[PDB]
Symmetry: C2
Subunit: 261 residues, 2 copies
């Protein structure tokens, strides 16, 4: 009696990437399910007995320490932002992002990105802080997305930006490289300069070197370097999850372990 596709789907919910269990073994579904249920209950018991930390929270804290220690100021800015910030980012029809916005009320949206708020902080802090100005933010961002194993509608972005002196492509690649070697994540950098940070075919980050013409709409007139990274994609690679759902804010998975036991 071979397993049904529905049964294999159920077992795949319970399977963790380092389990060495093969589904075709010939063992009955009920037995395979009971084995995986026992393993996942034990995984949750071990977390509860020892560390008790959530992967997404813990990763945020680790990234925060890395950037604070490298001289970047920690920002916490609004998640619910004025809708006019989207248009002011140059996002209109004929851009993909235009159709992906979660609107709230008449004049607000859930931010799909961190760039508007980081631009505003760079402009304001230039009146107080010495050159160069280095800032970062980690927090929720929102985009409407087609179903896909690499995309969430509710995700978490790291964004960092430096403005003034030292804003070279070399220095940008150095930050990225030190950061991902610190986290233990393999990558390739692929390249007004623009560049993407790839893990195989998966985009971990897009990064940039300024100035660009958009800066003037935000009151920025200095060179800059910066990048944006999705935390759930970093977790997906680090823990070898097959679907990014395992890494997201979720009621269905805790540290990549099914909560439906």
């Amino acid at each position: 009696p071979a397993l049904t596709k529905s049964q294999t789907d159920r077992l795949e919910v319970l399977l963790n990437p380092k389990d060495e269990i093969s589904l075709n073994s010939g063992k009955p579904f009920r037995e395979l399910e009971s084995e995986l249920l026992s393993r996942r209950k034990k995984d949750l018991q071990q977390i509860y007995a020892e560390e008790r930390e959530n992967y997404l929270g813990k990763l945020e804290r680790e990234i925060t320490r890395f950037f604070v220690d490298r001289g970047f100021l920690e920002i916490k800015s609004p998640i619910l932002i004025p809708l006019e910030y989207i248009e002011r980012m140059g996002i209109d029809n004929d851009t993909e992002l235009s159709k992906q916005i979660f609107r709230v009320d008449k004049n607000f949206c859930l931010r799909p990105m961190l760039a508007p708020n980081l631009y505003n902080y760079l402009r304001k802090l230039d009146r107080a802080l010495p050159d160069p100005i280095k800032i970062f933010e980690i927090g929720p961002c929102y985009r409407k997305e087609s179903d896909g194993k690499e995309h969430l509608e509710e995700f978490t972005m790291l964004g960092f930006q430096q403005m003034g002196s030292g804003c070279t492509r070399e220095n940008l690649e150095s930050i990225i490289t030190d950061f991902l070697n610190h986290l233990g994540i393999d990558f390739k950098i692929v390249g007004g300069d623009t560049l993407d940070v790839m893990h195989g075919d998966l985009e971990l980050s897009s990064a940039g070197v300024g100035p660009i013409p958009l800066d003037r709409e935000w009151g920025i007139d200095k060179p800059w370097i910066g990048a944006g990274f999705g935390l759930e994609r970093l977790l997906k690679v680090k823990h070898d999850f097959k679907n990014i759902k395992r890494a997201a804010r979720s009621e269905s998975y805790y540290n990549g372990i099914s909560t439906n036991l």
Copy 2:
């Protein structure tokens, strides 16, 4: 020449609670403004040179360590939640909260509270973890509010909950008391049991002891204790801010310092 109300409003933006400057001094507005601008620029320079941490992020990390160390599992659950969770919480017309919901699309809303997701986690984790089950979450919550010095529309909630053995009012008051003495925040506890944690006339928390009849709609049939705290209200008290805007996710204040310099 006395200061105008508009001028005093501008100086109050620049005034920090421990400044020992009196507005009626007789000094001209321009001079008082220049003094406060210099002080606030220096405050930002000192943060940037030394700690570089945001108060709201740092408070979240401190609270996280307190609860993890006391045996509570750290949860990160969705901020964008099904609208049906609101009705299932018993929130209908004739309740205040009913009119305060930020709706998104047809079937979702920004969570105004943490209770639905914590109920769901308690039910699911009861199948895996030993008694008692202790969990907590910190993160963004959203409510439409009238203008007021104690309310934000975008705020941050701590919610903790224990289920099973040990769920007594005494144990609940002990958690609260240890927590606020750890943070250095003065309070009074004022009291199916219900109780509020007050700082003067300001509500820091509402807390509760179960079971209650609502539990059955969430699949819960064990005793419980729990509470919810606003982080920005804790910061407002700790730092003696006159308006909670100083403590919120914001583009206008950084660690209670005006960014408009």
